[PDB]
Design an enzyme around this catalytic site. Sequence first.
Site, PDB file in Angstrom:
ATOM      1  N   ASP A   1       0.948  -0.702  -0.382  1.00  0.00           N
ATOM      2  CA  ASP A   1       0.038  -0.215   0.812  1.00  0.00           C
ATOM      3  C   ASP A   1       0.922   1.303  -0.396  1.00  0.00           C
ATOM      4  O   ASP A   1       1.749   1.497   1.081  1.00  0.00           O
ATOM      5  CB  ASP A   1      -1.449   0.155   1.472  1.00  0.00           C
ATOM      6  CG  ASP A   1      -2.206   1.165   1.368  1.00  0.00           C
ATOM      7  OD1 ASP A   1      -2.878   1.127   1.707  1.00  0.00           O
ATOM      8  OD2 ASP A   1      -1.641   2.160   0.850  1.00  0.00           O
TER       9      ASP A   1
ATOM     10  N   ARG B   1     -10.365   5.246   1.909  1.00  0.00           N
ATOM     11  CA  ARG B   1      -9.148   5.431   1.889  1.00  0.00           C
ATOM     12  C   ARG B   1      -8.674   6.746   1.480  1.00  0.00           C
ATOM     13  O   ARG B   1      -7.210   7.552   1.038  1.00  0.00           O
ATOM     14  CB  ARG B   1      -8.856   5.002  -0.042  1.00  0.00           C
ATOM     15  CG  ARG B   1      -8.287   3.089  -0.326  1.00  0.00           C
ATOM     16  CD  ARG B   1      -7.564   2.515  -0.685  1.00  0.00           C
ATOM     17  NE  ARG B   1      -6.782   3.270  -1.279  1.00  0.00           N
ATOM     18  CZ  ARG B   1      -5.310   2.961  -0.322  1.00  0.00           C
ATOM     19  NH1 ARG B   1      -5.683   1.648   0.274  1.00  0.00           N
ATOM     20  NH2 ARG B   1      -4.209   3.858  -0.675  1.00  0.00           N
TER      21      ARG B   1
HETATM   22  O1  LIG Z   1     -15.569  -5.458   3.430  1.00  0.00           O
HETATM   23  C1  LIG Z   1     -14.281  -5.938   2.826  1.00  0.00           C
HETATM   24  C2  LIG Z   1     -13.592  -4.776   1.534  1.00  0.00           C
HETATM   25  C3  LIG Z   1     -12.523  -4.903   1.385  1.00  0.00           C
HETATM   26  N1  LIG Z   1     -11.993  -6.208   2.004  1.00  0.00           N
HETATM   27  C4  LIG Z   1     -10.371  -6.614   1.329  1.00  0.00           C
HETATM   28  O2  LIG Z   1      -9.688  -4.478   1.227  1.00  0.00           O
HETATM   29  C5  LIG Z   1      -8.801  -4.602  -0.100  1.00  0.00           C
HETATM   30  C6  LIG Z   1      -9.578  -3.376  -0.664  1.00  0.00           C
HETATM   31  O3  LIG Z   1      -8.598  -2.363   0.356  1.00  0.00           O
HETATM   32  P1  LIG Z   1      -8.636  -0.647  -0.182  1.00  0.00           P
HETATM   33  O4  LIG Z   1      -9.772  -0.603   0.194  1.00  0.00           O
HETATM   34  O5  LIG Z   1      -7.399  -0.258   0.305  1.00  0.00           O
HETATM   35  O6  LIG Z   1      -8.146  -0.308  -1.633  1.00  0.00           O
HETATM   36  P2  LIG Z   1      -7.039  -1.006  -2.532  1.00  0.00           P
HETATM   37  O7  LIG Z   1      -6.223   0.132  -2.360  1.00  0.00           O
HETATM   38  O8  LIG Z   1      -6.768  -1.935  -2.015  1.00  0.00           O
HETATM   39  O9  LIG Z   1      -7.654  -1.753  -4.024  1.00  0.00           O
HETATM   40  C7  LIG Z   1      -9.765  -5.819  -0.720  1.00  0.00           C
HETATM   41  O10 LIG Z   1      -9.217  -5.915  -1.611  1.00  0.00           O
HETATM   42  C8  LIG Z   1     -10.511  -7.248  -0.003  1.00  0.00           C
HETATM   43  O11 LIG Z   1      -8.751  -7.536   0.695  1.00  0.00           O
HETATM   44  C9  LIG Z   1     -11.935  -6.626   3.233  1.00  0.00           C
HETATM   45  O12 LIG Z   1     -11.320  -8.158   3.586  1.00  0.00           O
HETATM   46  N2  LIG Z   1     -12.877  -6.598   3.315  1.00  0.00           N
END
Ligand SMILES: O=c1ccn([C@@H]2O[C@H](COP(=O)(O)OP(=O)(O)O)[C@@H](O)[C@H]2O)c(=O)[nH]1
EC number: 2.4.1.27
Length: 351
Positions: A100, A191
Amino acid sequence: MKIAIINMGNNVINFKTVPSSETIYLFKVISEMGLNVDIISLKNGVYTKSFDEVDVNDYDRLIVVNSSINFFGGKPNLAILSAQKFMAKYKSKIYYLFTDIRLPFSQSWPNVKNRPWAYLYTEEELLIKSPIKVISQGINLDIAKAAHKKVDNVIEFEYFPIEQYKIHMNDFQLSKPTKKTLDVIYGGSFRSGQRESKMVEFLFDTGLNIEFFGNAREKQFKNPKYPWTKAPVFTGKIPMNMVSEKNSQAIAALIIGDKNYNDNFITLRVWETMASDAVMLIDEEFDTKHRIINDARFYVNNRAELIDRVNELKHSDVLRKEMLSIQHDILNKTRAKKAEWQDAFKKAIDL
Ligand SMILES: O=c1ccn([C@@H]2O[C@H](COP(=O)(O)OP(=O)(O)O)[C@@H](O)[C@H]2O)c(=O)[nH]1
Ligand SMILES: [Mg+2]
Ligand SMILES: [Mg+2]
């Protein structure tokens, strides 16, 4: 040869929380590579050994999953303090898994020293001096370096698609045909608004039955720069090990990312979505070269195109099954490169 993997800022127990789940999954994929690995955390558990019962320098490699090191309410956070104390005593190179962009490696002592409870810790106990190698999920290493501009010991940077770990698990399996109850779905946090424009563009005022799961809530979208009338349905969080099954409830699932993620990061959601029973629809700007799938039907440029594409999938079950078959095939093409992936990982941690 013994490897230790820890999460720098969250307790690890089981799959009830996301950071714990991620650490356990990484532990599993490394173990399945034919390596001896222990997860070290606050206490001994099904998946862990406690920081106190072991001695960090008995391990040949120390791998650390990225995390924030912010103290809430200015109160102590043992997960962070114990992890950094563990890292501080290690005398070899530290491998930081940077998945991240907002969680670069950071020193805790600078924040602790000014705290009323500073007398509880010493600079010697918390200041991490070992050289560090940042293993970047993002291919653009300058962005990775810019993120770590404040640290004095983060020496190396190397790209490696860490989040492919879910598809390489020995127990991995594609989702099966699922009854549809939603047109579009997306799961994640707010985020800090680092993606608000896109979330509103693709998930708000679409006239489609859209659900938004995870930590995000409707009241968070209040930026005057991105107005909206009707929001999607916010349903709350679910366990990480249930994300693909959840995505599968919809006809399509959205792929978007942070500004610095576009044409750079291939996040975990890409795989959780691709492997699901939901057709993966990608924000054009996220992958302008269509490197994820060389088929323009999987890409959407704006709200209008997303609406058109989704309706198309709703009026043609054959089109929907065709596209699913294609993404499932593409996902498998990457799985067929597991050996390469494993060897690339081993090389990344100097093995
Ligand atoms: O209810 C939820 C929503 C999301 N996730 C996890 O959190 C990630 C999303 O993370 P973020 O919102 O930071 O977005 P990214 O930057 O990963 O796209 C997803 O891919 C899942 O692995 C989860 O475990 N439960
Ligand atoms: Mg991630
Ligand atoms: Mg198009």
